[PDB]
Design a protein around this ligand. Structure first.
Ligand SMILES: CCCCCCC/C=C/CCCCCC(=O)OC[C@@H](O)CO
Ligand SMILES: CCCCCCC/C=C\CCCCCC(=O)OC[C@@H](O)CO
Ligand SMILES: CCCCCCC/C=C\CCCCCC(=O)OC[C@@H](O)CO
Ligand SMILES: CCCCCCC/C=C\CCCCCC(=O)OC[C@@H](O)CO
Ligand SMILES: CCCCCCC/C=C\CCCCCC(=O)OC[C@@H](O)CO
Ligand SMILES: CCCCCCC/C=C\CCCCCC(=O)OC[C@@H](O)CO
Ligand SMILES: CCCCCCC/C=C\CCCCCC(=O)OC[C@@H](O)CO
Ligand SMILES: CCCCCCC/C=C\CCCCCC(=O)OC[C@@H](O)CO
Ligand SMILES: CCCCCCC/C=C\CCCCCC(=O)OC[C@@H](O)CO
Ligand SMILES: CCCCCCC/C=C\CCCCCC(=O)OC[C@@H](O)CO
Ligand SMILES: CCCCCCC/C=C\CCCCCC(=O)OC[C@@H](O)CO
Ligand SMILES: CCCCCCC/C=C\CCCCCC(=O)OC[C@@H](O)CO
Ligand SMILES: CCCCCCC/C=C\CCCCCC(=O)OC[C@@H](O)CO
Ligand SMILES: CCCCCCC/C=C\CCCCCC(=O)OC[C@@H](O)CO
Ligand SMILES: CCCCCCC/C=C\CCCCCC(=O)OC[C@@H](O)CO
Length: 199
């Protein structure tokens, strides 16, 4: 259907709005040259402050939630339209047409996709993330662990193959976007998150 193609294209274009760069540019800051140089909510928190980072997280989450919600309600949980809508949102966040195809790691937007599929699974995956983050204070370790957990939760809950395909590809892409963090974690060179007073 034409409406299926338009929903997927809409999801990619919406995901291509790198809200970390939007907010930082509104503030005259080049997010690629402050902090870690990454463009997600974590680096916004690191460079501009937790309140700006919460805003960016919410906006990047909504990019994934809104199109996936439309897909679920219009085409059904079993539809491969949902599969490609969720993938398009995440791929837009990672490879944004509006920001030189240099985007983020995909965690916030992927959580938004999952929330449209299953708010409970999204909550459980967030709880894993927060637990792992508070355990060791590595953002990357929390995101990798929670991404794997999210797939396992959808699998054991019995979600259909279109959803599992969407989740395994999104999850693999997220882990790939963390490949440098994994290298640092394996060699003891990953930094814990926070100011010197917090740490
Ligand atoms: C840009 C500033 C304004 C805020 C943006 C709007 C945020 C929320 C939008 C509502 C979500 C989209 C509607 C989803 C929905 O219920 O779709 C179900 C529909 O497909 C039933 O067939
Ligand atoms: C790079 C993609 C974005 C720019 C181009 C967007 C539009 C491109 C091609 C038009 C495809 C229209 C397909 C409509 C279609 O098959 O509708 C049939 C359906 O509505 C009922 O069977
Ligand atoms: C990077 C992603 C690119 C996506 C490109 C999507 C467009 C692909 C194929 C176009 C299909 C032709 C549809 C033309 C059309 O409106 O025909 C009407 C006809 O199908 C109804 O009888
Ligand atoms: C169809 C719904 C779309 C919802 C999102 C709407 C788009 C919102 C933000 C993206 C563009 C923000 C650009 C703001 C702006 O002009 O900032 C200028 C300033 O950053 C200096 O370059
Ligand atoms: C299997 C595919 C779906 C994966 C869903 C996403 C991973 C699940 C849970 C983590 C969500 C909480 C993220 C908390 C947070 O502050 O993230 C900041 C963000 O910038 C990290 O890159
Ligand atoms: C449409 C419904 C929206 C539901 C909520 C969407 C936003 C989800 C999560 C935002 C929380 C991210 C921050 C997580 C967090 O507390 O990180 C740990 C750290 O802050 C502890 O110091
Ligand atoms: C204008 C701003 C919001 C843009 C949202 C774009 C959403 C794209 C398409 C809307 C969904 C159309 C669904 C058509 C429909 O009834 O499909 C039913 C489907 O199950 C086939 O029988
Ligand atoms: C619905 C349309 C939304 C459009 C949102 C605005 C996107 C367009 C222009 C904003 C600036 C894009 C370039 C940002 C960028 O990556 O700058 C280059 C970077 O290497 C700076 O270090
Ligand atoms: C699949 C549908 C595609 C529809 C057309 C999308 C492309 C339209 C306009 C491009 C927006 C601004 C792109 C410029 C851009 O990303 O520049 C930033 C880059 O130089 C950062 O190094
Ligand atoms: C539903 C699947 C749609 C596929 C869309 C894929 C995402 C959007 C554009 C593809 C870019 C492919 C090339 C990779 C790329 O962006 O290079 C990385 C960038 O950092 C260098 O400019
Ligand atoms: C489906 C997504 C749901 C996520 C939205 C809810 C986020 C709300 C709260 C998370 C943060 C909890 C408080 C963390 C905190 O106070 O940590 C203190 C800790 O650093 C002490 O060592
Ligand atoms: C397995 C999924 C659940 C999430 C991971 C569970 C790991 C267990 C506990 C995490 C709670 C946060 C505090 C852990 C801890 O020892 O923090 C030390 C810190 O508070 C003081 O240096
Ligand atoms: C805090 C720790 C939480 C850990 C949750 C553990 C979930 C992981 C593995 C359990 C495997 C259960 C057996 C396989 C299973 O349910 O298959 C899924 C599917 O075939 C059911 O439709
Ligand atoms: C069974 C299917 C397996 C599919 C292959 C796994 C894809 C995941 C990660 C890609 C790892 C290699 C990176 C590719 C690469 O150099 O891309 C860089 C840039 O030009 C485009 O992103
Ligand atoms: C949900 C099932 C479990 C998934 C666990 C995924 C863990 C992924 C990558 C971790 C690789 C590094 C292992 C060592 C590590 O984290 O060390 C932390 C610190 O002590 C030194 O960097």
């Amino acid at each position: 259907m034409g409406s299926a193609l338009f929903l997927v294209i809409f999801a990619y274009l919406l995901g291509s709005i790198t809200f970390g760069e939007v907010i930082a540019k509104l503030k005259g800051v080049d997010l690629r040259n402050v902090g870690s140089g990454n463009v997600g909510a974590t680096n916004v928190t690191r460079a501009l402050g937790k309140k700006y980072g919460v805003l960016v997280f919410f906006l990047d989450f909504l990019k994934g939630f809104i199109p996936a919600l439309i897909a679920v309600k219009s085409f059904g949980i079993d539809s491969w339209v949902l599969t490609f809508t969720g993938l398009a949102s995440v791929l837009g966040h990672m490879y944004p047409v509006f920001f030189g195809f240099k985007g983020g790691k995909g965690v916030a937007t992927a959580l938004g996709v999952v929330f449209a599929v299953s708010p409970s699974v999204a909550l459980f995956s967030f709880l894993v993330w927060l637990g792992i983050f508070l355990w060791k204070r590595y953002v990357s370790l929390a995101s990798i662990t929670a991404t794997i957990s999210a797939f396992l939760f959808l699998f054991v809950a019995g979600y259909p193959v279109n959803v599992l395909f969407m989740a395994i590809v999104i999850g693999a892409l997220i882990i790939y976007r963390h490949r440098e963090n994994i290298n640092r974690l394996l060699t003891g060179r990953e930094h814990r998150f926070g100011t010197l007073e917090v740490l």
